[PDB]
Enzyme design. Structure first.
Site, PDB file in Angstrom:
ATOM      1  N   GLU A   1      36.614  32.311  45.246  1.00 24.51           N
ATOM      2  CA  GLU A   1      35.705  31.012  45.613  1.00 24.51           C
ATOM      3  C   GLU A   1      34.926  30.541  44.329  1.00 24.51           C
ATOM      4  OE1 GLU A   1      32.456  32.330  48.478  1.00 24.51           O
ATOM      5  OE2 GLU A   1      31.796  30.155  48.461  1.00 24.51           O
TER       6      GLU A   1
ATOM      7  N   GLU B   1      47.864  46.675  31.240  1.00 22.38           N
ATOM      8  CA  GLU B   1      46.875  45.808  31.734  1.00 22.38           C
ATOM      9  C   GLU B   1      46.361  44.751  30.532  1.00 22.38           C
ATOM     10  OE1 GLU B   1      43.967  49.825  30.047  1.00 22.38           O
ATOM     11  OE2 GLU B   1      43.526  48.699  31.781  1.00 22.38           O
TER      12      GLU B   1
ATOM     13  N   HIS C   1      32.562  45.123  35.368  1.00 18.75           N
ATOM     14  CA  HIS C   1      34.067  44.774  35.196  1.00 18.75           C
ATOM     15  C   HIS C   1      34.474  44.523  36.680  1.00 18.75           C
ATOM     16  CE1 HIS C   1      35.134  48.994  34.539  1.00 18.75           C
ATOM     17  NE2 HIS C   1      36.183  48.635  35.409  1.00 18.75           N
TER      18      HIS C   1
HETATM   19 MN   LIG Z   1      37.670  49.795  36.052  1.00 22.49          MN
HETATM   20 MN   LIG Z   2      31.452  33.009  49.658  1.00 25.75          MN
END
Ligand SMILES: [Mn+2]
Ligand SMILES: [Mn+2]
Lengths: 125, 118
Positions: free
Chosen positions: B107, B36, B7
């Site tokens: 990105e 969370e 994760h």
């Molecule tokens: Mn974690």
């Molecule tokens: Mn990159």
């Protein structure tokens, strides 16, 4: 549509030491170094951890430690082995809680996690 | 042996805004709900937890793979959210770079490692 993860990129003060960390902890395989090039001023390396592309570039460390983290999957049977590997590299770590995880930092305030459990397990608990 | 990615976890000041970014840019789906939340982007588990934004921005980044034919669409998704985005370099092997609201650089990238190694 997102096809999957492309890469993760870390900026590190010392490329050589980071290489040793990625090789030592994850068995990363170096597939590229910009140092094999003439007159390239910037220094980067690419690694594979299985099919995961990690890129490192020489630059400044993270200012502060935080709880932002990237977690890799390991098998519960290898937990003590991996804690050992982190040990032999001399890396700072969070204390092991009484799925389970090892959390450690590289040399540039990045936090990483080795986790034995799954999402399905996490949601059922 | 490393089996793969488990994760990735981000600390954010406002979970509602982060939810909108993850769902809006990556088509993340929420599977669990200061506290969370958990999401899947395909089979990538993302956890977000409420806390303090990174003091500073840097060029550390996580990049997701997209098809080149979807590039303009993804740029419009990031823009629609008012996210701070680098104007795309006129081009392939292309990227969209943006910050969320908490100084995390992301990105979207159309190329592969193999291609890049060429
Ligand atoms: Mn974690
Ligand atoms: Mn990159």
């Amino acid at each position: 549509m997102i096809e999957g993860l492309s890469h993760m990129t870390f900026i590190v003060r010392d490329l050589e030491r980071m290489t040793r960390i990625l090789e030592g902890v994850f068995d990363a395989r170096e597939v590229y170094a910009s140092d094999t090039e003439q007159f390239s001023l910037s220094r980067e390396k690419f690694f594979l951890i299985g099919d995961i592309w990690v890129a490192i570039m020489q630059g400044e460390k993270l200012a502060e430690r935080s709880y932002n983290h990237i977690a890799f999957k390991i098998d519960d049977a290898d937990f003590d082995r991996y804690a050992e590997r982190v040990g032999k590299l001399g890396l700072d770590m969070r204390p092991p809680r009484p799925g389970r995880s090892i959390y450690f930092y590289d040399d540039d305030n990045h936090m990483f996690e080795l986790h034995t459990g799954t999402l399905t397990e996490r949601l059922a608990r």
